[PDB]
Structures are given as structure tokens and as C-alpha cells.
Amino acid sequence: AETMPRQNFHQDSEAGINKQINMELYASYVYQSMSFYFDRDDVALKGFAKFFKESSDEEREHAEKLMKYQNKRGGRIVLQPISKPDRDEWGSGLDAMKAALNLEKSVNQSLLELHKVADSHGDAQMCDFLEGEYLEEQVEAIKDLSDRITNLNRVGKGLGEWHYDQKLLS
Amino acid sequence: AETMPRQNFHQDSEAGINKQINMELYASYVYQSMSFYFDRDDVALKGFAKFFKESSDEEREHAEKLMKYQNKRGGRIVLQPISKPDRDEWGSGLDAMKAALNLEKSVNQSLLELHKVADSHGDAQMCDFLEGEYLEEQVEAIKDLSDRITNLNRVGKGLGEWHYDQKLLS
Amino acid sequence: AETMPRQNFHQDSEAGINKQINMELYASYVYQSMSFYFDRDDVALKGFAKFFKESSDEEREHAEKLMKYQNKRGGRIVLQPISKPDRDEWGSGLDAMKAALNLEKSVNQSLLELHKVADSHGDAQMCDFLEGEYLEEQVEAIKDLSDRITNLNRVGKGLGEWHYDQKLLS
Amino acid sequence: AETMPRQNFHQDSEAGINKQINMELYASYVYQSMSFYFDRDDVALKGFAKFFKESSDEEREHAEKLMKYQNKRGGRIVLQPISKPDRDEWGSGLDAMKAALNLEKSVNQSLLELHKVADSHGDAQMCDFLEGEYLEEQVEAIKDLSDRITNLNRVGKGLGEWHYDQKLLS
Amino acid sequence: AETMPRQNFHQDSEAGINKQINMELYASYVYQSMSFYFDRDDVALKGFAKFFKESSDEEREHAEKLMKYQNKRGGRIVLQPISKPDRDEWGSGLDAMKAALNLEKSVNQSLLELHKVADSHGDAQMCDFLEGEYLEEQVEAIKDLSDRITNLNRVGKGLGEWHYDQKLLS
Amino acid sequence: AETMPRQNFHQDSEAGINKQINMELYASYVYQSMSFYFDRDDVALKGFAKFFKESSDEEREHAEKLMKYQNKRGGRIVLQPISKPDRDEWGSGLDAMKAALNLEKSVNQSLLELHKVADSHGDAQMCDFLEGEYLEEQVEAIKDLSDRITNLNRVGKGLGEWHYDQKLLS
Ligand SMILES: [Fe+2]
Ligand SMILES: [Fe+2]
Ligand SMILES: [Fe+3]
Ligand SMILES: [Fe+3]
Ligand SMILES: [Fe+3]
Ligand SMILES: [Fe+3]
Ligand SMILES: [Fe+3]
Ligand SMILES: [Fe+3]
Ligand SMILES: [Fe+3]
Ligand SMILES: [Fe+3]
Ligand SMILES: [Fe+3]
Ligand SMILES: [Fe+3]
Ligand SMILES: [Fe+3]
Ligand SMILES: [Fe+3]
After folding, report:
1. Which one, A1, B28, C159, D83, has the greatest CB density within 10 A?
2. Cβ contacts of residue B116 below 8 Å, gap of 6+?
3. What is the DSSP letter of E82?
4. Residue B140 sits at the chain F interface (C-beta within 8 Å)
């Protein structure tokens, strides 16, 4: 019945990992949409384009790391459609950053619930895996985006947004 | 209003590039599934894992190139769900290559359709874009996969698949 | 006789190549004028100066590539007066970018026209020459100018124009 | 029935590729004959020897490119005898250049008709392969040889031919 | 009324600078026409091609120097059409050199009269700018071209012209 | 007259050199065919591909050395059609090696024949030329192909052929 490697890895944890993989892929797709939106001729903010392209890349990397963890523990990857983002268009650099903060907080709460599932089944290894690989970077990300929101509000619309975008690129 | 850059770019073409983007994303997700299946403990062919990870990355890059093209011509990117692959498990290395060939032929026919759409609207720049970025690569990939199928049948299962896999990795 | 090299090169294509040479020379002269205007003591925007100087050079380079193409195909270069630009003065940096976009779109239409002539006469080589040498760089330029216009509107007049110009220079 | 890679590749195009491969071989052979003739003791023009040696190699390379193309699209190479050249001796340097121009014009017309065959069957990839790999080179070569005829008539026989030949070697 | 930098800069001198800019452009265009003519398949003198290409660039550079001068003194650039050359074809290498000598002599007389205009208005800085930037180069070029006419008559037609041309390229 | 360089070079030797040139060209074309066949999608043996491509080149190189020898001795090169190969398809790698051995032994007999002609006419220089340039490399090649046949029989069909081909490539 069990896969060869499998040890102290609960079915509830396995299912949860699969759900987290879909969420991280979803987040990647939201950031992809935002990145390409920022390169529209009528938006044209190359720093935001670049910032969200990297964020898309990172989210996909997170998903791929969970995929490999699943396999390593002897679980089985089950993929689901990657739902399209809620929006086609993402407003101002400030609007988009706020949107990113909300997305990262959603991702974080899912990871925190994932850790809770690990605790529940006394999976000490999975707890550590989640702390080291995701929780630490989530808190860093969330602070980073928050600082960006405060600055985007500080600089204002127009020239301020342009100058913040040039600093992103730099 | 029309977008500021837009010139000689038909709505038919715009819509068809959006469908092509989805399709390339779908192909990327198929290859991602295959790549991760090949690293299961009970499959464990790292060359196939590598080969399909690279193919997933290439398909995604094709999607992104189309996304930028859309923007450059002044059309608007419209994203749809990326549907999950047909299967969760992909058989032998031979089986998976056969599956890859059928996927790439489906992708090629879509690109040739895309070209015809550009032809239909006398979009000389788009024809060139598709010829140079996609059509040449696709013929090469199709031939490559075909060569791999012949060899996977030549070597047979067991040690043959194993040795073929090692040569993939190297 | 026909010239020694002449093969599958229609008189209609030959005349049209000559018309396009004149137009690319015209475009070069417009951008020369712009470039110089931006160095007036009462305008003094060195980045705009540099940007339109590069534009003038590229247009002249296009004209020269067409001259050489004419000769290569066994056609005969026929030069016409290079008409003075539409203006002596070119307004703000935003104004000048909008003027450039209009120019580049008129040039692109002329190039697409030229490709049409090549199609009509079943001149495969000429089509390819136009596609690879002019059509791709035209769509890039039109997107680039469009992005600039968005950003010049974004930053506004005064300090914004100043800061935009510095970044052109960088 | 079909080869595994075969897609959008017409029988007519396949047969015509095979005819073109024979023609490129035949041109290689003509140039080989000319090259060797120019190293006869009673001819002794090493520049002409080297020039036609290079041309022979290029033609063979063209044929071999078409051979790999055939295979890549899933067509089947079919080789025919390579007929001997119409002459055993090729006259003056000027005579040989005129003879080369005619050959290259015959080859170019064949490539133009091959492009038309691809057009007829809506084979966009084949069209691009011919344009990029053969048609551009052919117009270049036809111009080059025409310039050489002009200069060989300019310099005249005897010392002129000797000097022209040294410049070829240089 | 006056531009901010304007000091000791007469209206007459300003208008005359604008006339000189047109003349330098017109000379550039003549040399461009000659350069391209020499790369016709039925002319085919690459040394002459290169030589007149260089001369075309220098003349354009002269014009652009006068444009920046105008601006620097606080005058206003006024551009006129650049008339097409009096010929479409320029004969032998010797014919073209004779034609270049006449052109350069016409240009030099114009520069000498421009210097007189500066003299007339006691513009010491303008005098020095013309002497150092234009008059010295012109006497050098007039000597150079005269030496070339002498040698082109020396070597004679046919092989002589061919050898002269190679030496130009060298 | 006899040609200027001609000394101790019999008509019989001259004709035979021409026959050998044709045969070496024939052998080159056979190995070209083989080389290309091994790149078919349904054959796909890149090592065999590479090995017969080198063989084709070496045979052509032999042919060219004989052409130059003909000329050097004051003989006159007479070219004949290069007959198409015996097959269009060349079976397994073992099959193709056995076909090559037969070819090489037929070529060697022709070369030994040629040396005999040189002996008959007491042409010491020609004998040496044949010995040092062809006979030694023929005996090496025939041993090399024989070793390959033994090993292709040793390894068997399927995986063995595959592994042999990889080592050809290495
Ligand atoms: Fe192309
Ligand atoms: Fe010896
Ligand atoms: Fe994440
Ligand atoms: Fe995250
Ligand atoms: Fe793709
Ligand atoms: Fe693809
Ligand atoms: Fe242009
Ligand atoms: Fe342009
Ligand atoms: Fe060729
Ligand atoms: Fe060719
Ligand atoms: Fe000048
Ligand atoms: Fe001057
Ligand atoms: Fe041989
Ligand atoms: Fe041999």
C-alpha cells in the first residue's frame, strides 16, 4: 500500500501540500499578469514589470519546491487547474502593490495552516521544512511590500510613481 | 480607443495570440507534471526529469514571448485558466515521449493556424515573428522527439531505458 | 538590356524602393532638426538631443541599406530632393515624441506597402529583406515611442520633463 | 503511412527538395571542374582556383543543408546521378565567371520555384527555411559575380587577368 | 528680442550660416550618390565607393558642426530642402574626381564668403571658427583631389583605373 | 604537343587516374547517402551519422588529391557522371558496416590495379604517390571496419547497437 520512502507522513499533510502547490502556482500567475500589464504601452513602468516578473518566478519556484518535497516524502503530486487572476488590469503601481500584499498574506495564512497540519500529525520534519523554506521568506516579503506601499503613498501619483519605478529598476 | 502603437494588427490575430498563450502555458504544465512524475521514488529517471523540466521551461518562455508580442503590437493580454493535464502519471519514458510528440504536433498545428490568421490579414510582421520564433523551433523539437522515440524502442525496457536516461542526463 | 544581376525584380518594386529611400532620408532630416532644436539654449534638453540624434542616424542607415539593396538586385538608384521638415521648432519633449510616433507610423505604413508590392510581384527575397531589416525594428520603435509618450504624460511638465530627459541621457 | 514527424509537408515539396539537392550537387561538381582547370599548368590562375574551390564547397554545403531539411520534416532523401559538367575546359577567367553567373541564375530560379511550391502548399516553415538559408545568399552571389565580370572586362586580358587573379587570392 | 547667449552675432552671419548648412548637406548628398553609383554591378569600383562614402560622411559632419555653431551663438537653425544632385550617374573614376574637385571649390568659395561676412561684422570668434574648422580642411581636400586627378590621368583607363581603385581601398 | 610538365607519364596511367577519381567520388556519394540515412527519424543513430560523414569527406579528399596529381604530372582531368549509390536505405549499423567493407575492398583493388599500371609503365614516382597517399590508409580503414563488424555482431541488435553508436560519437 504505502510508497517505499513513506514514514510519519499523514494523508492530511499530503493533500494539504497538493493544495498549497496549486495556490503557489496561482500566485505565480497573478504576478505574471501584473508583470505583463506593467509593460503595456499605456502603463509602461519597467521597474514594476521587473519586480512582478521576479515575484512570479519566485512563486513558481515555491510551487516546484513543494512538488519535490511531496515526492521526497513518498506522497503523490495531484495537480489542479490554475485559475486565471481576478483582474485583467491592475491599476497604479500603488494599487498593484496593495493587491500583492493581500495575495502574500493569503499565501502566508495557507502556509501557517500547512504548518498547523504538520504539527497536528507530529511531523517534525515537515514543520522544519516549512519554517525554513517558506515562513521566513513570507515575513520578509510582506515587510518589503508594506514598505513599498508606504513609499508609493509618500511619493504620490505622476512623477513620484515614475521615480519610484526607476528605483525599482535600479 | 485603439491603442497608441496599434497598426495593421487585426482583432482575429489578437484573439488568436491570446488562445496560443494559453496553449503554451498548458503545454508547460503538462511537461511540469511529466518532469515531477519522473522523480517519484518508484519511477526515478532523472534524465527524463531534466529533459521534461527543460521542456516545461521552454514552453513557458514561448508563452511569455507571445505575451510581450501582444503588448508590443498594442493588443491586450487576456489570460484563461491553465487546465490541468489529462493524467497524473505518464508511464514509461517511451510512453511519455510519445505523449510529448502528440502535444508538440498539437502545438505546431495551432502555430501554423496562427500563421494562417496573420496571412489572412496581411500581417507581414506577425508572419515573420511566428516563423522565426516558433515554427523553426517546433520542426526541430518534433524531429528530436521522434529520434528519441525510435531510440527508446531500439533500447527496450529495463536496462535500455536506464542507459537512455543516463545519456539524457549527460 | 536588363542589368546583369536582375532576376525576379519588378520595375514596380524598383520604383517603390526608390520612393522608400527618399522617405527614410526625409525621416532622418526630421530627426536631425529635432535633435538640434533640443540643443537650443532656450530648450536645453540634452537627452532628447541625444535620442533624436540616434534616430536620425538610424533612419539614414535604413535609407542606405535600401540603396545598397537596389543595386544588389540590379535596380537603379534614383534620388529626389529631401524635403525640409514640417516644422522649424518642435515644442516640448512630449510634443516631439508624439510627432515622432506619427512619423514612424507613416514610415511603417510605407514599409508595409512596400512589402505588399513585393507580394504582388511574388518577390520572396524582397519580402524577407523587408521583414527582417525594417518591419521588426519598426514595431519595436513604435512600442518604445509609445512607452515614452505615456511616461512624459505621467511625469508632467517642468521638473518631470527634466528628470525624464536625464534618464534618456543615462 | 506517414513518417512520425511529418506535418504540413506536401509530397510535391518533398519531391522538389530532392530535385534541388541534385541541382546543388551538380553545381558543386561544375565548380570543382572549374577550380581544377584553373590549376592546370597551361592555365595557372591560383586565385580563380581558390575562388571556385570555395564555391564548390558552398554548393555542396547547400545540398547537405537540404538533405538534413528533408529528414527533419520527415521526407525521404532520394539521390540521382550527379551529371558531369557540360565542359571539360572553361576558357578565360572572364569566360568562367560568365559561366558561373548563368549557373547561379539557374540555381536561383530553381530556388524561387521551390519557394513557390512551398507557397502553393501553405508551408510557411519551408518558405522561411528557403528565404533565410538560400535566397539571400543567392542574390549576394549573383551581385558578387556580376561585379567580377565588370572588372574582368575592365582589366582586360594578359596582365589585367593576372592582377585580378592575385587580388582574388589576396 | 535677442536670444540669451547672443552677443556680437549679426543677422547677416546667422542667415549665411543657414545657407552654408544647406550647401554642406547638398555636398553630402552628391557624395552619397557618387558612392552608391560606384557599387553598381556595371561600375564596381569599391575603392571609389569607399572614398566617396567617407566624403559624404565628412560633409554631413561639417553641416552638423555649423548647426551646433548656430545654436551656440544664439542663432536659429533654418533648414531648406536638400536638392537632389545634378546627375544620377557619374562616369569614370576620373570623371567623378573632377566633379568632386568642382564641388569642393564651390564649397570653399562659399566658406571664404562666409568668412568675409564675419569680417564685415567684426565677428572675430566666427572667423576663427571657420578658419580652424573648415578652411584648413578645404585646402587639404582640394590638394588631395587634384593629386588624384593627376594620377587617374597618369594610369589611364581599364587596368589603370582598377589599380588606382585598389589603392584607394588599401 | 605534350603538356609542358609531362615526363615519364603514360596515357594508360593518365586514363586510369581519371577512372580512380570517378570511383573515389562514387564512394564519397555512397557514404554521404549512408550518413544522411542514419539521421532519419526512424533510424536515429548519430554516431553512425558522424562516422559516415567523415568517411564521405575522406573519399572526396582522395578524389581531389588525384585531381591535383593528374594536373601536376601534366595529365588532363576528365570527369564522368557520379552514379547514384546502389541503395536508398542502408539497414542496421552492422549492415551498413558490411556494405562499407565491401566498398573499401573494391576501392582498394582499384588502387592496387592503379599501382600495377604505374609499375607496367615504370612510373616510380606514381607508385610512391599511390603507396604513401592511398594504399596505407586503405589497409588501415579495412582493418578498422573489420573490427567494427566484429563488435557490432558482438553487441547484437537493440541496446547493443545503441551503445556502439554512442561510443562512435565519443
Ligand atoms: Fe524571415
Ligand atoms: Fe615510400
Ligand atoms: Fe510563494
Ligand atoms: Fe510567497
Ligand atoms: Fe511552445
Ligand atoms: Fe512548443
Ligand atoms: Fe527608417
Ligand atoms: Fe524607421
Ligand atoms: Fe547553392
Ligand atoms: Fe543554392
Ligand atoms: Fe564640407
Ligand atoms: Fe566644408
Ligand atoms: Fe578513397
Ligand atoms: Fe578510400
Report:
1. B28
2. D122
3. B
4. no
The rounded Cα F91 to chain-centroid distance in angstroms is 20
Nearest one of A106, A111, A82, A86 to A34, comparing CA atoms:
A86
C142 touches B: beta carbon within 8 Å: yes
Catalogue the long-range contacts made by A38-41 (C-beta closer than 8 Å, 24 or more residues apart).
A38/A90, A38/A93, A38/A96, A39/B68, A39/B71, A40/B71, A40/B76, A41/B3, A41/B4, A41/B5, A41/B71, A41/B74, A41/C143, A41/C146, A41/C147, A41/C150
Residues 6+ apart with CB under 8 A from E3: C41, C42, E74, E75, E76
Q: Which of E146, E154, D169 is nearest to E163 (CA)?
A: E154
CA atoms within 13 A on the CB side of D123: 23
CB contact under 8 A, C76 and E5: no
> F23: which residues sit within 8 A by CB, 6+ positions away?
F107, F110
* C-alpha cell at position D80: 540521382
Secondary structure of chain D in HEC code, one letter for each residue:
CCCCCCCCCCHHHHHHHHHHHHHHHHHHHHHHHHHHHCCCCCCCCHHHHHHHHHHHHHHHHHHHHHHHHHHHHCCCCCCCCECCCCCCCCCCHHHHHHHHHHHHHHHHHHHHHHHHHHHHCCCHHHHHHHHHHHHHHHHHHHHHHHHHHHHHHHHCCCHHHHHHHHHHHC
- C-alpha cell read off for D166: 592575385
Q: Could you tell me which residues come within 8 angstroms of residue D169 by beta carbon, excluding any fewer than 6 positions away?
A: D46, D47, D50
Q: What are phi and psi of E82, to 5 degrees?
A: -95, 105
Amino acid sitting at position E98: K
**What is the rounded distance in angstroms from the CA atom of residue D4 to the CA atom of residue B142?**
9
F156 touches chain B (CB under 8 A): no
Number of other residues whose CB lies within 10 A of the CB of residue C76 = 16
The span from the CA of C133 to the CA of C122, in Å, is 19
Residue with cell 596505407: F136
Q: After which residue numbers is chain B interrupted with C–N beyond 2.5 angstroms?
A: none
- Residues of chain D with Cβ-Cβ distance to C13 below 8 Å are none
Q: Give how far Cα E14 sits from Cα of B67, C30, E20, Å.
A: 53, 21, 10
Q: Which domains does chain C have, with CATH numbers?
A: 1-170 (1.20.1260.10)
- Chain C positions in Cβ-Cβ contact with residue E4 (cut-off 8 Å): 41-42
- Cell numbers that stand for D64 in this block: 547537405
Chain A touched by C156 (CB under 8 Å):
yes
Contacts of B139-145 with C-beta under 8 Å, sequence gap 24+, read B139/B108, B139/D5, B139/D72, B139/D73, B139/D125, B140/D72, B141/B104, B142/B101, B142/B104, B142/B105, B142/B108, B142/D5, B142/D7, B143/D5, B143/D71, B143/D72, B143/D73, B143/D74, B143/F41, B145/B97, B145/B100, B145/B101, B145/B104
The conformation of residue F85, written as its DSSP 8-state character, comes to P
Q: Say if residues D16 and F51 touch (Cβ distance below 8 Å).
A: no
User: Which SS3 state, helix, strand or coil, does residue A12 take?
Assistant: helix
**Which residue in D54, D71, D76 has the most chain F C-beta atoms within 10 A of its own C-beta, making it the best mutation to test that interface?**
D71
The single residue listed with the C-alpha cell 573494391 is F106
Q: Which positions in chain C touch B72 (Cβ < 8 Å)?
A: 139-140, 143
Q: Which method was it determined by?
A: X-ray
Which residue intervals of chain C are DSSP H helices? Answer: 11-37, 46-72, 93-120, 124-130, 136-155, 159-169
Among the listed residues F77, F139, A72, A17, the one whose alpha carbon sits nearest the alpha carbon of residue B42? A72
Is the separation of the CB atoms in D41 and D77 below 8 Å?
Answer: no
Under 8 Å between Cβ of E34 and E99: yes
Say if residues F45 and F152 touch (Cβ distance below 8 Å). no
Distance CA C64, CA F125 (A): 58
Stated length of chain D: 170
Q: Half-sphere exposure (CA, 13 Å, Cβ side) for B69? A: 25
